[PDB]
Amino acid sequence: FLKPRLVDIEQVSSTHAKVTLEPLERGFGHTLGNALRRILLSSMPGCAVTEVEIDGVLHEYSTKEGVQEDILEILLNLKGLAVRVQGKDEVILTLNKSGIGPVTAADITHDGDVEIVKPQHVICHLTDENASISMRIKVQRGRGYVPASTRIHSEEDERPIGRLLVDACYSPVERIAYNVEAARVEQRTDLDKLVIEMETNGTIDPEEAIRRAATILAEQLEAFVDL
Amino acid sequence: GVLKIVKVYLAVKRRIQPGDKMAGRHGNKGVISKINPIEDMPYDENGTP
């Protein structure tokens, strides 16, 4: 009944890493590793842009007079930006770019809480010099895929129709594979060593995530202890 | 007769959902019965589902 334990999270790259657990018993690490997988793909507090009220945009079916791309496209490239928040769950920013050039993600009103993983992610392409595009980006935090579709039912009467929304996919995690194999300790025939090979987008830290996700499993054990 | 005509242009995105008939090129039809979460996807040694 030996307790379980991890080792140093082997950080090969900033995007993906691998944890390793030595103290596993026969069977546990296998089914629990699969059980963790679902959790590390569902109950994860992700960050996703929800409301983007743009300067000269009443609807996403238009193109800013001065940009190369299309507004609809630009909104998908906003979903392509990985951002971190620390204190508040929500924050409104403002993109301010002018001049011919691939608009990097570091020209925005940078709040101390807003945290980009890569300020080099081009959102749009400015092709003119006298075009200063501005856009308030309301990003927040939640978990799982929560689309603007399911959210427009309450609506709160969004009369200000300059405010164009987007689907909030709250998922940091990405590709999860687990490498089960014989755990070689000298006092036992063979235990189990779970080498969790994980891919992330680069927003929430793995250890933060796994203790947090295990606490969600704790929530999901509550009634399983209650009879 | 009709001196003033006003033709409106609405815009409605219709996405992909369970129930839409989808196929391929080699003559393989079908209808999505239930688009399941990527969490039920069988993955290889790699991890890519």
Tokens of A208: 């933060």
Rounded Cα gap, residues A9 and A200, in angstroms: 14
* Cross-strand bridge partners of residue B21: B31
Which residue in B39, B45, B47 is closest to A42 by CB distance? B39
Rounded Cα gap, residues A33 and A224, in angstroms: 19
Minimal C-alpha gap between A109 and chain B (Å): 31
| B37 interaction partners in chain A (CB closer than 8 Å) | 41-42
CA-atom Rg of chain B in angstroms: 21
Mutating which of B9, B15, B39, B40 best tests the A interface, going by the most A Cβ atoms within 10 A?
B39
Q: What share of chain A is helix, strand, coil (3-state, %, to 5)?
A: 20, 35, 50
Residue-by-residue DSSP string for A195-217: EEEEEE-SSS-HHHHHHHHHHHH
Contacts by A210-213, CB closer than 8 A, 24 or more apart: A210/A19, A210/A36, A210/A40, A212/A45, A213/A36, A213/A39, A213/A40, A213/A43, A213/A44
Give the CA diameter of chain B.
72
- Of A201, A198, A202, the C-alpha closest to A179 is A198
Give the residue on A whose Cα is nearest the Cα of B49.
A175
Rounded Cα gap, residues A146 and A165, in angstroms: 13
Minimal C-alpha gap between B38 and chain A (Å): 9
Query: What Cα–Cα distance (Å) separates residue A100 from each residue in A48, A94, A145?
Result: 28, 19, 35
* Structural contact between residues A184 and A190, judged by C-beta atoms closer than 8 angstroms: yes
Rounded Cα gap, residues A102 and A122, in angstroms: 6
Which residue in B11, B38, B46 is closest to A177 by CB distance? B46
Rounded Cα gap, residues B43 and B48, in angstroms: 6
Evaluate the CA torsion angle A81, A43, A142, B37 in order and state its sign. Answer: positive
Rounded Cα gap, residues A18 and A7, in angstroms: 10
Q: Do B47 and A38 make contact, defined as CB atoms within 8 angstroms?
A: no
Task: Provide CB contacts within 8 A for A116, sequence distance 6+.
Answer: A81, A82, A83, A84, A105, A106
Residue-by-residue DSSP string for A147-192: -HHHHTTTTT----TTEEE--EEE--EEEEEEE--EE--SSSS-EE
Give the residue on A whose Cα is nearest the Cα of B38.
A41
CB atoms within 10 A of CB A135: 24
Distance in Å from the first CA to the final CA of chain B: 63
- Of A95, A78, A84, the C-alpha closest to A202 is A84
CB atoms within 10 A of CB A120: 10
Minimal C-alpha gap between A112 and chain B (Å): 34
CA angle A86, A87, A92 (to 5 degrees): 90
Evaluate the CA torsion angle B27, B32, B35, B40 in order and state its sign. Answer: negative
Q: Do B39 and A61 make contact, defined as CB atoms within 8 angstroms?
A: no
CA B4 to chain CA centroid, nearest Å: 38
Map residue A194 onto helix, strand or coil.
strand
Tokens of B25: 């090129």
Rounded Cα gap, residues A219 and A1, in angstroms: 22
CB atoms within 10 A of CB A176: 21
Tokens of A35: 């059980």
| B43 interaction partners in chain A (CB closer than 8 Å) | 175, 177
| B35 interaction partners in chain A (CB closer than 8 Å) | none
Rounded Cα gap, residues B15 and A167, in angstroms: 12
- Of A200, A197, A192, A202, the C-alpha closest to A19 is A197
Strand A191-200 and strand A182-183: pairing? antiparallel
Q: Do A177 and B11 make contact, defined as CB atoms within 8 angstroms?
A: no
Rounded Cα gap, residues A1 and A69, in angstroms: 60
Map residue A78 onto helix, strand or coil.
helix
Mutating which of B12, B36, B38, B44 best tests the A interface, going by the most A Cβ atoms within 10 A?
B38
Backbone angles phi, psi at B14, to 5 degrees: -120, 115
CA angle A197, A202, A207 (to 5 degrees): 55
Give the residue on B whose Cα is nearest the Cα of A147.
B15
Q: Do A59 and B45 make contact, defined as CB atoms within 8 angstroms?
A: no
Type of residue numbered B47:
G
